[PDB]
Each structure stands twice: as structure tokens, then as C-alpha cells.
């Protein structure tokens, strides 16, 4: 009863799933788990003049995201990563912009935007040739090691690791540069997942295409291994204008595959693959920071 990832992706898409509550112009950079049978979603927020973060009140159906409470975090967790860390029975929210290049907080109740612990350092390193520095971290463990992957708005993807026994903890300053391409080809929004029922991991990376933001996919047999391009061009993307089935947006941008198992392995089921993404009206212009990003969900077609 196991499925494989396809070599060519075709999706259907929802429309816009929610409008930002009064005071925000955008909801962004989603991370999501299923928690007690309900979708639990964190994301960045923007007023146009500053970035923050929020959690949606848990909801069973994506069609009900529009009515879900939108709960601001009192301390911003921009571009967050949410997961349950089973070896220490603790939830983790990792993010950027704070006292360190990457930061994390922990909790016993991930539904509370303000129940998170004091911030701790996740990563303290620096990268060359980047206007942003380290951006858009994700975390993923196999059975042995916890990995940090991140981007730099600069065509590179970076990786760090520690024994899982040492997590939650600080990766420190060291990293490996694992991919190098043009800025457009490997820009930001990197995510890594375990493919359930396959000896395979999936990496997606947001690229800047001629027609809008899209995702390029890569596979590996191991988290410390080499990545092989899978659906890695604008014409044959993991997800983009070419194959999203979305009419409301020409951009498929920073989000999260839907993770039914909330744990640190970031496992996705290739039999029922779905993608919570940010998109925007093709008509929306102005400064990047004020763009009206909105949540949508792609469902992989049989």
C-alpha cells in the first residue's frame, strides 16, 4: 500500500483560504501539522512595515480556515518551523530574526501562540554573498541525527547536523554548503521531508521563475547524502504556475507539505500529498514587504 513520488507533478488547488485579520496585509511562510485531528498552522505576518508571526485556531477542514481565529504571537517567530520532538516529549518552534541567526522556543501546548519558552540559539553562523544572511531554516531528523537546512537568497543551500540526543540545542556556527546554483534557481523557502514507504528524502526549494515563484524538487537516499534534481525547472516544477491548477495566483511560494505525523522526521505520505503554500494576486504590485500573500492548498492528482 505504498506509493512513490511522481517524476511529473500535477495538482489541483483551492482558492484563497483566508484573509489576514485587520492590521495585516499578508499571511506567509506557513508551517503545518495535524494535531489531535485538526490542522495546526503557524505563519509569518506582515503589516507592510514589520514582520510578525501568528497561529490559526485549530480547524478540521481547509474549507474552514477562512473562519479560524487568527492569533498573533507577542514575540515574532518569522518563517517558523513547527514540530513535535518525540525523544523529549516537547514541541519546538524554530525561526529567524532575533538574538541569533536562527532561534527556537519549546512548548507543551503548540496551540498557544504565547505559551512558548524563552528563545534559545539554534544557529550562530554566517554566510558569504548574501543580502539576508541565513534564511528559511527547516529541521529534520532521521533515526540518528538532527539536521538543519537553510538558504541565503543567494543560490546556495546549507546544512548542519548534530546527534539527535543533543537536541533541542544549538548547531553553533559550522555548516556544509550542499548546493550551489544561480540566485534564481535556489533562492529560499527550503523544505526537507521523509517519503513514507520509500528509502528517500524530498527537498523542495523556492526559485524565481520568469512567470512567478515556483518550487524545484530534489531527492536523496540519506539526509547527509547527495541531492538529485527531480522536478527542477519552471516548465516541469515540483509546484508552480505550470502545474498548480490555481487561477488566483501565478506564484507558488514559501509553505509546507501537509504533515500528518507532527514529529521531527518530517514524514509525508506520497499517497496523499498536499502542499500549503503562499500565493498572491497577479495584479498586486508595490514593495515586496507589502505584497498581499494568502494561504492556498494544492492536492496531488492521482
Residues that bind ligand FUB (CB under 6 A): 28-29, 44, 51, 78-79, 135-136, 188-189, 254
Which residue, 209 or 270, is less far from ligand FUB as judged by CB? Answer: 209
Give 97: exposed, middle or buried? Use CB within 10 Å, 0-12, 13-18, 19+: middle
Q: Which long-range contacts (CB under 8 A, 24 or more apart) does 218-226 make?
A: 218/179, 219/5, 222/142, 223/140, 223/142, 223/145, 223/147, 223/161, 223/192, 224/145, 224/147, 224/159, 224/161
Segment contacting Cl ion by CB under 5 A, of 8-16, 103-111, 155-163, 256-264: 155-163
Rounded to the nearest 5 degrees, what angle is found at the Cα of 235, between the Cα atoms of 231 and 237? 30
* Interaction partner, residue 189 (Cl ion, ligand FUB, none; CB < 5-8 Å by kind): ligand FUB
- 161 makes contact with Cl ion (CB under 5 A): yes
* Interaction partner, residue 153 (ligand FUB, Cl ion, none; CB < 5-8 Å by kind): none
Q: Which of 26, 97, 60 is nearest to 280 (CA)?
A: 26
Cell 538529485, located at residue: 228
* In the complex, minimum distance from the CB of residue 135 to ligand FUB, in angstroms, rounded to a whole number: 5
* Interaction partner, residue 53 (ligand FUB, Cl ion, none; CB < 5-8 Å by kind): none
Which residue, 195 or 239, is less far from ligand FUB as judged by CB? Answer: 239
Please count the residues of this chain forming the interface with Cl ion, following the rule CB under 5 A. Answer: 3
Which residue, 53 or 264, is less far from ligand FUB as judged by CB? Answer: 53
- 166 makes contact with Cl ion (CB under 5 A): no
- Rounded CA gap, 246 and 170, in Å? 39
Give 220: exposed, middle or buried? Use CB within 10 Å, 0-12, 13-18, 19+: middle
* Interaction partner, residue 176 (ligand FUB, Cl ion, none; CB < 5-8 Å by kind): Cl ion
Buried b / exposed e across 234-267, counting CB within 10 Å, b at 16+? bebbbbbbbbbebeebbbbbbbbbbbebbebbbb
* In the complex, minimum distance from the CB of residue 158 to Cl ion, in angstroms, rounded to a whole number: 9
What three-state secondary structure class fits 149?
Answer: strand
* In the complex, minimum distance from the CB of residue 92 to Cl ion, in angstroms, rounded to a whole number: 19
Among 50, 60, 74, 176, indicate the residue that binds Cl ion (CB under 5 A): 176
What three-state secondary structure class fits 290?
Answer: helix
* Interaction partner, residue 161 (ligand FUB, Cl ion, none; CB < 5-8 Å by kind): Cl ion
* In the complex, minimum distance from the CB of residue 78 to ligand FUB, in angstroms, rounded to a whole number: 6
* In the complex, minimum distance from the CB of residue 203 to Cl ion, in angstroms, rounded to a whole number: 14
Segment contacting Cl ion by CB under 5 A, of 46-54, 74-82, 173-181, 288-296: 173-181
Chain contacts with Cl ion (rule: CB under 5 A): 159, 161, 176
Amino acid at each position: 500500500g505504498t506509493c512513490a513520488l511522481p517524476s511529473t507533478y500535477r495538482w489541483s488547488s483551492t482558492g484563497v483560504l483566508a484573509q489576514p485579520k485587520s492590521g495585516w496585509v499578508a499571511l506567509k511562510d506557513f508551517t503545518t501539522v495535524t494535531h489531535n485531528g485538526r490542522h495546526l498552522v503557524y505563519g509569518s505576518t506582515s503589516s507592510g512595515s514589520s514582520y510578525g508571526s501568528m497561529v490559526f485556531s485549530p480547524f478540521t477542514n481547509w474549507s474552514d480556515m477562512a473562519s479560524a481565529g487568527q492569533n498573533a504571537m507577542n514575540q515574532a517567530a518569522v518563517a517558523p518551523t513547527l514540530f513535535y520532538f518525540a525523544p523529549k516529549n516537547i514541541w519546538v518552534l524554530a525561526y529567524q530574526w532575533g538574538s541569533w541567526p536562527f532561534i527556537y522556543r519549546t512548548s507543551s501546548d503548540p496551540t498557544d501562540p504565547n505559551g512558548w519558552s524563552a528563545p534559545q540559539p539554534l544557529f550562530t553562523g554566517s554566510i558569504s554573498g548574501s543580502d539576508t544572511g541565513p534564511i528559511d531554516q527547516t529541521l529534520i531528523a532521521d533515526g540518528q541525527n538532527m539536521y538543519l537546512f537553510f538558504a541565503g537568497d543567494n543560490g546556495k543551500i546549507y546544512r548542519a547536523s548534530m546527534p539527535i540526543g543533543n537536541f533541542p540545542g544549538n548547531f553553533g556556527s559550522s555548516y556544509t554548503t550542499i548546493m550551489s546554483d544561480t540566485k534564481a534557481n535556489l533562492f529560499e523557502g527550503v523544505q526537507v521531508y521523509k517519503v513514507q514507504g520509500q528509502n528517500q528524502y524530498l527537498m523542495i526549494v523556492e526559485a524565481m521563475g520568469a512567470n512567478g515563484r515556483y518550487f524545484r524538487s530534489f531527492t536523496a537516499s540519506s539526509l547527509s547524502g547527495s541531492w538529485t534534481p527531480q522536478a527542477a525547472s519552471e516548465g516541469n516544477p515540483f509546484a508552480g504556475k505550470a502545474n498548480s491548477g490555481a487561477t488566483w495566483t501565478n506564484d507558488i511560494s514559501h509553505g509546507d507539505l501537509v504533515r500528518d505525523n507532527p514529529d521531527q522526521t518530517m514524514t509525508v505520505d506520497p499517497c496523499n500529498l498536499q502542499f500549503l503554500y503562499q500565493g498572491k494576486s497577479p495584479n498586486a504590485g508595490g514593495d515586496y514587504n507589502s505584497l498581499p500573500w494568502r494561504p492556498g492548498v494544492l492536492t496531488l492528482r492521482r
